[PDB]
Design a protein around this motif. Structure first.
Motif, PDB file in Angstrom:
ATOM      1  N   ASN B  51     111.442  73.596  -3.491  1.00  0.00           N
ATOM      2  CA  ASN B  51     111.155  74.402  -2.308  1.00  0.00           C
ATOM      3  C   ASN B  51     110.589  73.565  -1.173  1.00  0.00           C
ATOM      4  OD1 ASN B  51     111.251  77.599  -3.066  1.00  0.00           O
ATOM      5  ND2 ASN B  51     110.750  76.354  -4.856  1.00  0.00           N
ATOM      6  N   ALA B  52     109.736  72.617  -1.522  1.00  0.00           N
ATOM      7  CA  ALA B  52     109.064  71.757  -0.548  1.00  0.00           C
ATOM      8  C   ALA B  52     110.041  70.992   0.347  1.00  0.00           C
ATOM      9  CB  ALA B  52     108.125  70.772  -1.238  1.00  0.00           C
ATOM     10  N   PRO B  53     111.042  70.273  -0.214  1.00  0.00           N
ATOM     11  CA  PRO B  53     111.962  69.479   0.609  1.00  0.00           C
ATOM     12  C   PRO B  53     112.853  70.333   1.514  1.00  0.00           C
ATOM     13  CG  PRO B  53     112.764  69.564  -1.640  1.00  0.00           C
ATOM     14  CD  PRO B  53     111.411  70.215  -1.652  1.00  0.00           C
ATOM     15  N   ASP B  54     112.810  71.652   1.338  1.00  0.00           N
ATOM     16  CA  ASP B  54     113.637  72.554   2.143  1.00  0.00           C
ATOM     17  C   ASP B  54     112.786  73.481   3.002  1.00  0.00           C
ATOM     18  OD1 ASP B  54     116.696  72.347   1.016  1.00  0.00           O
ATOM     19  OD2 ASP B  54     115.263  72.086  -0.624  1.00  0.00           O
ATOM     20  N   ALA B  55     111.565  73.703   2.556  1.00  0.00           N
ATOM     21  CA  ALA B  55     110.628  74.603   3.220  1.00  0.00           C
ATOM     22  C   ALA B  55     110.222  74.122   4.597  1.00  0.00           C
ATOM     23  CB  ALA B  55     109.394  74.801   2.364  1.00  0.00           C
ATOM     24  N   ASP B  56     110.195  75.073   5.513  1.00  0.00           N
ATOM     25  CA  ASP B  56     109.803  74.822   6.891  1.00  0.00           C
ATOM     26  C   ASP B  56     108.319  75.060   7.077  1.00  0.00           C
ATOM     27  OD1 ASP B  56     112.881  76.323   7.618  1.00  0.00           O
ATOM     28  OD2 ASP B  56     112.444  74.228   8.096  1.00  0.00           O
ATOM     29  N   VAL B  57     107.677  74.174   7.819  1.00  0.00           N
ATOM     30  CA  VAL B  57     106.249  74.285   8.087  1.00  0.00           C
ATOM     31  C   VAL B  57     105.950  75.112   9.329  1.00  0.00           C
ATOM     32  CG1 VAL B  57     106.443  71.914   8.942  1.00  0.00           C
ATOM     33  CG2 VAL B  57     104.196  72.995   8.826  1.00  0.00           C
ATOM     34  N   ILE B  58     105.024  76.043   9.167  1.00  0.00           N
ATOM     35  CA  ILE B  58     104.574  76.886  10.256  1.00  0.00           C
ATOM     36  C   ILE B  58     103.123  76.565  10.542  1.00  0.00           C
ATOM     37  CG2 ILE B  58     104.581  79.214  11.204  1.00  0.00           C
ATOM     38  CD1 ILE B  58     106.138  80.142   8.797  1.00  0.00           C
ATOM     39  N   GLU B  59     102.784  76.490  11.804  1.00  0.00           N
ATOM     40  CA  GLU B  59     101.420  76.223  12.198  1.00  0.00           C
ATOM     41  C   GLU B  59     100.683  77.541  12.382  1.00  0.00           C
ATOM     42  OE1 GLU B  59     101.181  72.339  14.110  1.00  0.00           O
ATOM     43  OE2 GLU B  59     102.802  73.009  15.408  1.00  0.00           O
TER      44      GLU B  59
END
Lengths: 60, 60
Positions: B51-59
């Motif tokens: 999930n991590a290598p595909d997951a998008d980061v939200i601030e």
């Protein structure tokens, strides 16, 4: 193909951290550390995405 | 292409957690969770790699 997303937030000490959350709402991973800059928090995410998928797990 | 590895250890409450550490020795990520099974710790790692290598980061 996944269902998850990273979220950067503030700690109790005004620090920038993050946690990975699945669609279900369970914590998958966390920054581990805390910093005074949002950039560094995001750098941690990118740092993990660049090592996590290849890093081998060992039992300490 | 990376330099890191996952390590599973015990929490103060006898729980199995893990942390990703680079060659430098910095904490890249942590399980975030904490449970009484070593398997669950390792399952978290594999789940993050999925999930991590595909997951998008939200601030947040």
């Amino acid at each position: 193909m996944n269902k998850a997303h990273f979220e950067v937030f503030v700690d109790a000490a005004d620090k920038y951290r993050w946690r990975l959350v699945h669609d279900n709402g369970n914590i998958l991973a966390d920054s581990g550390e805390g910093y005074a800059s949002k950039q560094k928090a995001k750098q941690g995410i990118e740092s993990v995405k660049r090592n996590a998928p290849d890093a081998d797990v060992i039992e300490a």
